[PDB]
Structure formats: structure tokens, C-alpha cells
Amino acid sequence: AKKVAVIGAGVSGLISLKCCVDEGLEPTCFERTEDIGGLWRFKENVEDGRASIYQSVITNTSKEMSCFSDFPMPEHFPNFLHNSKLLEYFRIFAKKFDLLKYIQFQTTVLSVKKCPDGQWEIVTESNGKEQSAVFDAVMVCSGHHILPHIPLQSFPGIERFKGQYFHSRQYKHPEGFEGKRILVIGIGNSASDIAVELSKKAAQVFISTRHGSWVMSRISDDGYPWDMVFHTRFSSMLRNVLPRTVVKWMMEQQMNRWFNHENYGLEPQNKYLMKEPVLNDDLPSRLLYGAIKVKSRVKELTETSAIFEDGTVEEDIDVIVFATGYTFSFPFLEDSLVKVENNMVSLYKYMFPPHLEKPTLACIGLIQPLGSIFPTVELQARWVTRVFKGLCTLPSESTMMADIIKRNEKRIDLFGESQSQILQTNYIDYLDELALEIGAKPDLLSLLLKDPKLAMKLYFGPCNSYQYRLVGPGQWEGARNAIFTQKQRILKPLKTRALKASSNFPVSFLLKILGLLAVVVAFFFQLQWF
Amino acid sequence: AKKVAVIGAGVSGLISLKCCVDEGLEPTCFERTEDIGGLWRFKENVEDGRASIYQSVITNTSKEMSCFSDFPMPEHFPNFLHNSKLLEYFRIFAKKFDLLKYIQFQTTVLSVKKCPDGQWEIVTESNGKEQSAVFDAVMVCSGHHILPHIPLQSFPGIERFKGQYFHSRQYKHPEGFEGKRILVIGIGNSASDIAVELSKKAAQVFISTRHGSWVMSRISDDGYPWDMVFHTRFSSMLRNVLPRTVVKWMMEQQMNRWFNHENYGLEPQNKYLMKEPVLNDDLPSRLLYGAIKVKSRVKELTETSAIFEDGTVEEDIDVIVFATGYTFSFPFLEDSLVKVENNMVSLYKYMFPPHLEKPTLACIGLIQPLGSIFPTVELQARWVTRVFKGLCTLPSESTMMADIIKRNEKRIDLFGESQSQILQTNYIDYLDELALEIGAKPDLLSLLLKDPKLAMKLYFGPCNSYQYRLVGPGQWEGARNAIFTQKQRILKPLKTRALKASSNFPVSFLLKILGLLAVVVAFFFQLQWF
Numbered sequence A, B: 001a002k003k004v005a006v007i008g009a010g011v012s013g014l015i016s017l018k019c020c021v022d023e024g025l026e027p028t029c030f031e032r033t034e035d036i037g038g039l040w041r042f043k044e045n046v047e048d049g050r051a052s053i054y055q056s057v058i059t060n061t062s063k064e065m066s067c068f069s070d071f072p073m074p075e076h077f078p079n080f081l082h083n084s085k086l087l088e089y090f091r092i093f094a095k096k097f098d099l100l101k102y103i104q105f106q107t108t109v110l111s112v113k114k115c116p117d118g119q120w121e122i123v124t125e126s127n128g129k130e131q132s133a134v135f136d137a138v139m140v141c142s143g144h145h146i147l148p149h150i151p152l153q154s155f156p157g158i159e160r161f162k163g164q165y166f167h168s169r170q171y172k173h174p175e176g177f178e179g180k181r182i183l184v185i186g187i188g189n190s191a192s193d194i195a196v197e198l199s200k201k202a203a204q205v206f207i208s209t210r211h212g213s214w215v216m217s218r219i220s221d222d223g224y225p226w227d228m229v230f231h232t233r234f235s236s237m238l239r240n241v242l243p244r245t246v247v248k249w250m251m252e253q254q255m256n257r258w259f260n261h262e263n264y265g266l267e268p269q270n271k272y273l274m275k276e277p278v279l280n281d282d283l284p285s286r287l288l289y290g291a292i293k294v295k296s297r298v299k300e301l302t303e304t305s306a307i308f309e310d311g312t313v314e315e316d317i318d319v320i321v322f323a324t325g326y327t328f329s330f331p332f333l334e335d336s337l338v339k340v341e342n343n344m345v346s347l348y349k350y351m352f353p354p355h356l357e358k359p360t361l362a363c364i365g366l367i368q369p370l371g372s373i374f375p376t377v378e379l380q381a382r383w384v385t386r387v388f389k390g391l392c393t394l395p396s397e398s399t400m401m402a403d404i405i406k407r408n409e410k411r412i413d414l415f416g417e418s419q420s421q422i423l424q425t426n427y428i429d430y431l432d433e434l435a436l437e438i439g440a441k442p443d444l445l446s447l448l449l450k451d452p453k454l455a456m457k458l459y460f461g462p463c464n465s466y467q468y469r470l471v472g473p474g475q476w477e478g479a480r481n482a483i484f485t486q487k488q489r490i491l492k493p494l495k496t497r498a499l500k501a502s503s504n505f506p507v508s509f510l511l512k513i514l515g516l517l518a519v520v521v522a523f524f525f526q527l528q529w530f
């Protein structure tokens, strides 16, 4: 299988495109829009078929935790990115790896039909007249933050409500909602970012939840990004092995350092969970300021008031904004292919339909991991390109149907029953899973003997995308290197001002003690017991 | 002295006005503007004689750490205040205590002249024609954040610079500086707030300092306001008694918890100091995002570039904003009265001119303490009204001239040599000083025996304004009370969503152990040593 299809030029489209040329395939990318990036290409209107983002979105993952395994973000980039500055990375990636030539822009995909199976018959439309073609295999990168989910039916009285109401998707700018009374629904990173942005210049903002989330800043230990302290092999172990509610005590304490969540009033119901927490740096302060007040779930709505689950009422609310998240569909696809039933997506590892017979089609970017997606869809694409070729193989339908069950059953146990968590997954464990398949996952134990400086820094240090190019196929020398020098690149854009003292004999601080102090303790009651 | 003058209807004017009626005097307040609040009354233009604030200023002191000693902020107020919501408190204070009748608006004061001394002859102008009157004593509340300090002469090349440049004072709105390259000077809470606000929607913002400050959020331990953990008798002791550079290690560690200041690049020169640190909740994040880059002092300016002290250069900078702070003058006053020479204000405790012979004039609000000013200028006014009457007395000029020296000599040693710190002062120590004079400062030691629940909470708990109405003159029953119930009022506006489980036999935390665990340890090797 050489002639391959990639639906959409999202992030996922661009990485598969590269993973393809890398496994020596010939890809054709269809893009509905004029340009690349999908979600991350901010436009002011809300054009259909592509996800809207509000002008002021910043990423919630470090640059050295979210760059591709063999392509670090330039040193002069900040560790969290304005959507526009991220797009740039993408553009700069599509330049370096010459991926832009396969993109057919303004060429939406209308149907992907099976041939007499191992190929596919894809109907696309260009500017008016619609052509047709056949492909050996298909990669689907159409996104899943496009269909707004607006659960109006669990807001009795909405009909009666005057004012103005609209879903997060629609949101772009705050100018216009000056000094208005505004209620936002949900504790989506959307809800939070929105509420906050609007709250600075608004009369009052509220924010509804039944369940309440845990808030958390991207600022972490010594102002290093949260993800490079949170996502580290070693810590993952702890989360997995340690008893569930011993990890709960651990979460509670970690999360509460910033502020007491009970007091600020977004204590979660079941702290049991390990759902995705919200990554706003402003929300706690903005509550403190009083610009936002959290609130129980809207019980009922009237013309200009809102009743609440705890029997409170807020009056003269000019605006409701439903940041109740999104859904996803495949309207160019067999209705049996992407079977999604009772909160469960039947896809082998959110990728392959198990009821296929030739493993020639997979869904990339239909997943929401606790860490960055970009390195996730890269290993998604590595595993897939290699399956198509046949260098990699699925088990039997029997096996794949059994995994899909047990994965989902674990998942709901770990992230709750919400319609917002169909695609939740622990970050590393998954990344490992994908790299086992293609045998690109380092086996540290063995490596400890060869290279201990790595072994330590791979397990205890931050689990970069880079790690997955140490062993296995299609490697990158600047992977060992990248890892060892990431501290430079993280501080390049920050540490923009120099004192200039010394570190050979400075009377500042003290240090060295911690070294010598323990060194002597080493040599204690260890006299030769043969 | 009955007939008293209060220059200006600032915060200081309004508290003296109240302190006056309270010590049974008859005041006349002159106000240059149409209304009260001075600084805190946001207007869109920058009218002369009154301090400008930018539309979006929030306080940097808790409500229960900054309300007046006998007038708590309404419970439904947030703990940090939009300038407008603070003004409201003031208006609500001017209502309750009926102070608005003494205010002559649109009546600026032109000269305060000594009579044949113990009175004063004040020339004021109304709408056109200027009248005159005599007063027994004078209280000056004209502010000191009105005269911009623009040190153009330590920016070689400014003449050459095209673009646009203007001082913090002038600032109001960010709209207009979209996608412009902008450099702000200094690490004033101004500089910081400004830089930040502008940075979200700007091409790039820089922020110059030679010296670099310590940044710190208003969010503190368990999301309680910083001031109620920082400003507590007990902690003050530590700061005073402990060796200077042992308090340094203590600051370093406290401050650095949020982020490593070296890495983010505002490591201070001499960490020795206890200068005022900046209170921005946003700046660390906004650096991380890359919207602000800190920078060494501007060495030199050109037409569209800026050279730096460390030999860096930023290019095409459309705007310079000098947030280099303010100064102060008294243009309605004898030039010998407020003698200010080589970084030293010769005023007994930033209040009384020592070269007077009848102590009948004092300056209130000419001071910048590490805590809230509002309770500071209240004890300033209590001490003063009582001096006028003669219930309180200054020492001899010999003594007062010696204090002024030693105070200043301590001060420079403690806050550095900057002309941004002429009026710096440790918060409590001063508040105590003022309350000693009128004997309203509790002596805890004695009270330990009488009331231990207080004694503990007065020393170890937060040092509210309320404390100074426990003993001494003009008290308030709701002072003991206020103190004991402040936790309610702080949580009233925050804790706006409740779970409803239990706290008599609930499973999914633990607690009580820490109690019983230590309790048993108490009764160890203490068997009757008579």
C-alpha cells in the first residue's frame, strides 16, 4: 500500500504526512479550507467544518513537552504559546519537511467508500466540479472540536429567557460584553478562559458546575512548566501502582497548594477521579477579585433570572454562554465504521475499526490525553504508517473487541462517566503502548547498564517527545542530545536578564554542604560483611 | 484649637474629617475637584492636581486588612477591590459618618500662611473669585502620586527617539496599543500592571530594571490574602530580631516558591533589602507566555531602537512608557515647612514640621508603608487631632531633629537609596508607634492573663486595623468581635458553592490525628518534678 489518503491538514494531517514520506509512502492530503493548522489557525468568523478558537488562546503544554520527537521548537520560542506562535511552529515544520506539496486546499472530502477489498474510493469536491479517486489506505484527521454540544434540554426555561445565549465555539472577542451580567456554563478550559477574559471588563460573571473541577496553573516547581514535573515516567508509576485514594490524598495536597478549593468553591464531588483538570493561571485571582463567582448547576432559567441547584438565584443576567464542550462525527464515512455507543468508541486504541478485515484505515487525532496531543498523534502516525506497509500487525477481531471493552471499562473508572471524557487517557502509558507496537519505546532497565546518565534522566527527568527516537526505527541523533540540553531552550526565552557573580567561590547562599554532608553518611555501618 | 482645616478630600481627608468630629472639633474640608476619593475616583482624562489611575486597577490589600479600625467592609465585598468598588466603601463611609457636609468642592487651596502665632491664614479660590479665612490648625491631605517623576536625563538619546513616550500617570486604557512594540521602564506595580495589560494584545512588551524586584501574588497560603499571612505581629518580630541575612534566606525561599526569580530574570541585586515587592498575579505567567520580556536598564536610546546595559538591543520599539514613579510637592506652603533634602524628609514621623513652635500643622498621607495606608492614615489622624487639642505632646525640637535623622538612617539601610522609597516604612512597627502615642496599642503580655483567646490571635493571627480600638480612647465594641469573625467575611464572597457532606463522622479525609498524636507526646517524661 503506497498511495495513501490523509483527510484534513490539521496537526494530525501534517504529522501523518511526514510519518508517511518517512516510511516511504505517497500521500495525498485533502483540506477543506485554504490553509493548514485547522483549529490553531485563528479566524475571526466561525466557518463551518473547522474548530473556532477565541483570539487570545495560549497552549497548556510546554514547548519541550509538546514538540515532535525529532523537531524541537526553536530556542527563541516561549514555553507556552499564543495560538498564532504555535501555528508558526507548524508552518516551520511543514517547510522543513516539505509537506505542503501534497495538500489540496479547498478540496473537501464527501465520502470514503470501500472498494472490492484492499483499497478505498474517495469522493472529493473542488471549486464546483467533484472528482473521484482510489487509495490503498486512509488516515482521518478531521478533528473533533467542531460540533458544539449544547445540552439545552437540561436547562428548563431557556425558551422563556430573553437576553442572548451562545456556545463557546461562537466566542472570539470580549469587546462587546462590557459591563453586562454574564453566566457561563461548565468548567471547561473554555468556560474558564472565557469567563476570565469577559470578567475583567464585565458587570459580573458567574460560572456554573454541578461537579466542580480542580484548577491548576501552568506555573510549577521553580516556575518550570507543569507538564515537565507532572509527566515523568517515575511519577506515572506512583499514580498507577499507589492505591487509588492514596493518589487522591496526593492530588488534594498538590492541587490545594495554590488555594483551598473548598473555600474558593470548586471542591470536586468525587476527588476519586483523575479527569483532566483546568489550566487557567488567572481564575483563582479573578475569583478573589470578585469578577467571577462560581455557582452550582443551573436548575432552571426564566426571562432574566436563573434558579440554581442549591436554591440560589442570580437576577438580570443579560448573557448565557454554554461552554459545555463539543462532540464529533464522520459525515464522509460508513455509519458502522466509527461505532460509538453508550459512551464508548469501538476503535482499537482510538485508531482502527476492529470490524475491518484489511487494516487499511485508521482515525488519528480522535483522542484527548492528559499530556500534549502533538507527540501522541505522532506515535499514532508512526504505528499506523508501519501497519499499512505490513511491518506491524493487529491481533484478531476477537482480541481487539476484548481490548476495546477493557480499555473503556478502565477509562470510565478513572475519569468518570461524563460525555466530556469519551477519549481520556493517561499520557505516558498510552505513548509507551504506541511505541511498544513499533518497538521505539526505550527499555530503561537494560539501558541503565549501557548509559546510566540517560537511564536516570529518562525515568526521573521529564518524559519529552524526544525519548521515542532513542531506539526503534526512524531515529534522530539529536534525541539523546535534545534531552540533555532542554534546560537551555526552556530558559532561553525567560532568563532574559543577568546578575553576573560566580559559582566557584560565591559568598551567596551556601550549597556544597548537601553534597559532602550526605557523602560521609554513605560511609557509615558498611564495614565488610562478607 | 476647634476650627480645623483639612486640605483635600482624599482617603486621608475623609478619615481626618471623621477623626475630628470624633475628638469633637469643627473641620472645613477644601476639595479642588467636584467629588471625593481623590486617586480612587477613576476619570478618563488626567485633570491636573489629582492622581490618575488606569481603568483596571485592583487593590493590593485585603478588605479586612485595610478597612478602618471601627468600620469593617460589608461582608458581601471581595477581598481585593476594583478601584470603583473601593470608592464605594469610601462613599458608604462618608454616608455613615456624615462627613460630606464639611466638603467644599471646586475650592482649591492656594496658600496656607502663618498668622502672628496659634493659627493659620488659608487662601482658597472658588469658581472665579478667591476668598480667605483663618484656622486654628491644618491637616494636609493633598496626595503624593500626582507629580510624575520622569528621569529623562538618565536616558541618553531620548531626543532622537521618534515613536511615542509617556509616563504611567497618563495611562488609562490599553486599546490603542494593539500589536505595537512597547517598552516600559521600572518595576513599579504600575510598570507591572501596565506592561501586563498592554502585553496581552501587543506585538511585544519589555520591562527594564537595573535592580530587579521580587514578584509576589496576592494569593497566599490556602488562598488567603498575602497581607494577612505577611502582616502578623509574630512574623514582624522575626523580621526585626532575626539577623538581617537570615531574614534574607527566609525571603528568598518564600518568594521563590512561586517561581525561580533568577530563571525568570528578576533576581534582585541586593536581596539584603526589604523594599516593597510587586503585587501582580499575572506577571510570572505573562512572562512565561512570552508577552513580556524583562530587561536590564536602558543604557541608551536611538530613533527606533534601545541599547541596554548588558549590550543587548531591541529594535523597532514604537512606544516607551516611563513607569518610574512619582514625586510630591506642596505649592500652597512655606518652602521651609516641608524640608526635603538629599533623599530625606524632615518631618517628625512624616507628619509634623519640627521647626514649628506651636504643633498646629501636620501632613497626613505622605507615607508608603508595606501594608495598607488606610489604617495608617487613621492612626495618623487619631494622633494628630489629639495633639492639636493638647491631649498629646511632641518632644523638643532637639529630640525630634535627632529622631528624623535616625529614622531616615534606619530606613535607607532597610529599603535602599532609591528616591522611590523616601517614604518606606515597616507596617506594624509604625502602626504601633502611632498607637503608643495615643495609648491605643494593646499590650498583649498583660492581656495574655486576662484574655488568652485574643492574646494568641492578636500576636499570631492577622494584625487587622480593628486591634487599635481594643484599648485607648474612642473604642468600638465590634472590635474584639470583628477580629473573631473575620474568617466569615473573607469567605462570604468567595465560598459561593457548597458540597454538603459532614464533619462529625466523614470518611474520605482523616484529621484529628495531628491533635491526639501530639496530645500523648505532651505527657512523656514529665513525671512529678516538683
Ligand SMILES: Cc1cc2nc3c(=O)[nH]c(=O)nc-3n(C[C@H](O)[C@H](O)[C@H](O)COP(=O)(O)OP(=O)(O)OC[C@H]3O[C@@H](n4cnc5c(N)ncnc54)[C@H](O)[C@@H]3O)c2cc1C
Pocket: A007, A008, A009, A010, A011, A012, A013, A030, A031, A032, A033, A035, A036, A037, A038, A039, A040, A049, A050, A051, A053, A057, A058, A059, A060, A061, A066, A107, A108, A109, A110, A141, A142, A143, A144, A145, A332, A364, A365, A366, A371, A372, A373, A374
Ligand atoms: C481551545 C483548545 C485548546 C487546545 N490546546 C491544546 C494545547 O495547548 N496542547 C495540546 O497538545 N493540545 C491542545 N488542544 C487539542 C489539540 O491540539 C487540537 O484538538 C488539535 O489542533 C487537533 O488537530 P487535528 O489535526 O486532530 O484537528 P484540527 O486541527 O481541528 O483539524 C481539522 C482539519 O480537518 C479539516 N477537515 C474537516 N473536514 C474535512 C473534509 N470533509 N475534508 C477535508 N478536510 C477536512 C479541517 O478543515 C481542518 O484542516 C486544544 C484544543 C482546544 C479546543
Ligand SMILES: Cc1cc2nc3c(=O)[nH]c(=O)nc-3n(C[C@H](O)[C@H](O)[C@H](O)COP(=O)(O)OP(=O)(O)OC[C@H]3O[C@@H](n4cnc5c(N)ncnc54)[C@H](O)[C@@H]3O)c2cc1C
Pocket: B007, B008, B009, B010, B011, B012, B013, B030, B031, B032, B033, B035, B036, B037, B038, B039, B040, B049, B050, B051, B053, B057, B058, B059, B060, B061, B066, B107, B108, B109, B110, B141, B142, B143, B144, B145, B332, B364, B365, B366, B371, B372, B373, B374
Ligand atoms: C495604582 C495604585 C494602586 C494603589 N493601591 C493601593 C492599595 O490597594 N492599598 C493601599 O493601602 N494603598 C494603595 N495605593 C497607595 C494609596 O492607597 C494611595 O496613595 C491613597 O489613595 C492616597 O490617599 P490620599 O488621600 O493621601 O491622596 P488622594 O486620594 O490622591 O487625595 C487627593 C485629593 O486631594 C485634593 N487636593 C489636591 N491638592 C489640593 C489643594 N491644594 N487643596 C485642596 N485639595 C487638594 C485633590 O483634588 C483630591 O481630591 C495605591 C496607589 C496607586 C498609585
Ligand SMILES: NC(=O)c1ccc[n+]([C@@H]2O[C@H](COP(=O)([O-])OP(=O)(O)OC[C@H]3O[C@@H](n4cnc5c(N)ncnc54)[C@H](OP(=O)(O)O)[C@@H]3O)[C@@H](O)[C@H]2O)c1
Pocket: A057, A058, A059, A060, A151, A154, A168, A185, A186, A187, A188, A189, A190, A191, A193, A208, A209, A210, A211, A297, A298, A323, A324, A325, A326, A368, A418, A419, A420, A421
Ligand atoms: N489550551 C487551552 O487554553 C484550552 C482552552 C480551551 C479548551 N481546551 C481544550 O478543550 C477542552 C476543554 O474543555 P472544553 O471547554 O473544550 O469542553 P469539555 O472539556 O468537554 O468541558 C466542558 C464542561 O462543560 C461541563 N458541563 C456540561 N454540561 C453541564 C451542566 N449541565 N452543568 C454543569 N456543567 C456542565 C462539563 O462538566 P462534566 O463533563 O463533568 O459534566 C465540562 O466540565 C480540553 O479537552 C482542552 O484541551 C484547551
Ligand SMILES: NC(=O)c1ccc[n+]([C@@H]2O[C@H](COP(=O)([O-])OP(=O)(O)OC[C@H]3O[C@@H](n4cnc5c(N)ncnc54)[C@H](OP(=O)(O)O)[C@@H]3O)[C@@H](O)[C@H]2O)c1
Pocket: B057, B058, B059, B060, B151, B154, B168, B185, B186, B187, B188, B189, B190, B191, B193, B208, B209, B210, B211, B276, B279, B297, B298, B323, B324, B325, B326, B368, B418, B419, B420, B421
Ligand atoms: N494596587 C495596585 O495594583 C497598584 C498599582 C500601581 C501602583 N501601586 C502603588 O503605587 C506606588 C508607586 O508605584 P509606581 O510604579 O507608580 O512608582 P514606584 O513604585 O516608585 O516605581 C517606579 C520604578 O521606576 C524605577 N526607576 C526609577 N529610576 C530608574 C532608572 N534610572 N532606571 C531604571 N529604572 C528606574 C524604580 O526603580 P528604582 O527604585 O531603582 O528607582 C521603580 O522600580 C507603589 O507603592 C504601589 O504600592 C499599586
